[PDB]
Structures are given as structure tokens and as C-alpha cells.
């Protein structure tokens, strides 16, 4: 796996898994999935990865 | 103008726990939202090390 591809993969890991445009911003409580931006998280009542009901949408901060 | 090797090393460093700098970040603090500790180090803090907000709950994260 090339260095350019490893870098591209870590950069993609930071992206919202729905829009792949905005960065991840929300952790779902209680399942813990960290897979959406704030906009893409609005419409979901169940986690689109594991289908656990979302009790709370916690905004994340890296700094 | 940063080399590919250095850009990769920097993104990898960004995933490290800010207390141990060994294990990866795995916990988000509720309510402040800071994502700065691994599971083990989160057990040592009662306040967020970034903003000093009292931590009400330590939520495990999953990227996949
Ligand atoms: Zn999105
Ligand atoms: Zn989930
Ligand atoms: Zn740690
Ligand atoms: Zn904080």
C-alpha cells in the first residue's frame, strides 16, 4: 500500500460517511458510532451503521 | 510544501490520546464533546484536559 494511498485513506477516515464532503462531527449516544457530520445526523433517529436508536447526538471537538 | 511521508505521520499523530500519546483516542466526553483520550486514560480524568468542563459521561467511539 503506497504512502499516497495511506494518506488518502486517513484523510477519507475524517469524512462524514453519508455525504463524504463535510467532516465527521457527531457521536451517537449510546452506540458510539462517529460517522456523520451535523447536517447528515439531523434526519436519523437510528444509527445507519448498527440501527440502535439514537438517544443523543453529541457534537465532537478535536481541540 | 510538506512531504507525503510527513503529512501521513502528522495525521497518525492526530489520532493519539493526549494523555499517553501511545494508544488511540477512543472516548468522547459528554457534555463538552472533546475527543482526546483513550479508554484507559479517560479513567484518570474528572475534568476535560482541553476545556476543564466536568465530565458527566465517557462515551466510547466507533469509526466503523
Ligand atoms: Zn454529511
Ligand atoms: Zn451505531
Ligand atoms: Zn491514553
Ligand atoms: Zn472539553
Residue numbers in the entry:
A (entry chain B): 435 to 497
B (entry chain A): 434 to 497
Question: Which passages does the manuscript contain on this structure?
Answer:
We report the development of three ubiquitin variants (UbVs), each binding selectively to the RING or U-box domain of a distinct E3 ligase: monomeric UBE4B, phosphorylated active CBL, or dimeric XIAP. This family uses a RING or U-box domain to recruit E2 enzymes thioesterified with Ub (E2∼Ub) and facilitates transfer of Ub directly to substrate. RING/U-box domains promote Ub transfer by shifting the equilibrium of E2∼Ub into a closed conformation (Dou et al., 2012b, Plechanovová et al., 2012, Pruneda et al., 2012). We generated selective UbVs for each RING/U-box domain and used biochemical assays and structural studies to identify two types of UbVs: competitive inhibitors of E2∼Ub binding sites on UBE4B or phosphorylated CBL and an activator of XIAP.
We determined the crystal structure of XR bound to UbV.XRD to 1.57 Å but were unable to obtain crystals of an XR-UbV.XRM complex. XR adopts a dimeric RING domain arrangement similar to structures of BIRC3 and BIRC7 in which the C-terminal tail of each subunit interacts with the second subunit (Dou et al., 2012b, Mace et al., 2008). The groove is formed by the β2-β1′-β1-β2′ β sheet that comprises the UbV dimer interface. Two symmetrical hydrophobic pockets at the base of the groove bind the two Phe490 residues from the XR dimer. Symmetrical salt bridges between UbV.XRD Glu46 side chains (Ala46 in Ub) and XR Lys472 side chains also appear to stabilize the complex. UbV.XRD did not stimulate UbcH5B S22R∼Ub discharge catalyzed by XR T489E or XR F490R, even though both variants were comparably active to wild-type XR in promoting UbcH5B S22R∼Ub discharge in the presence of Ub74.
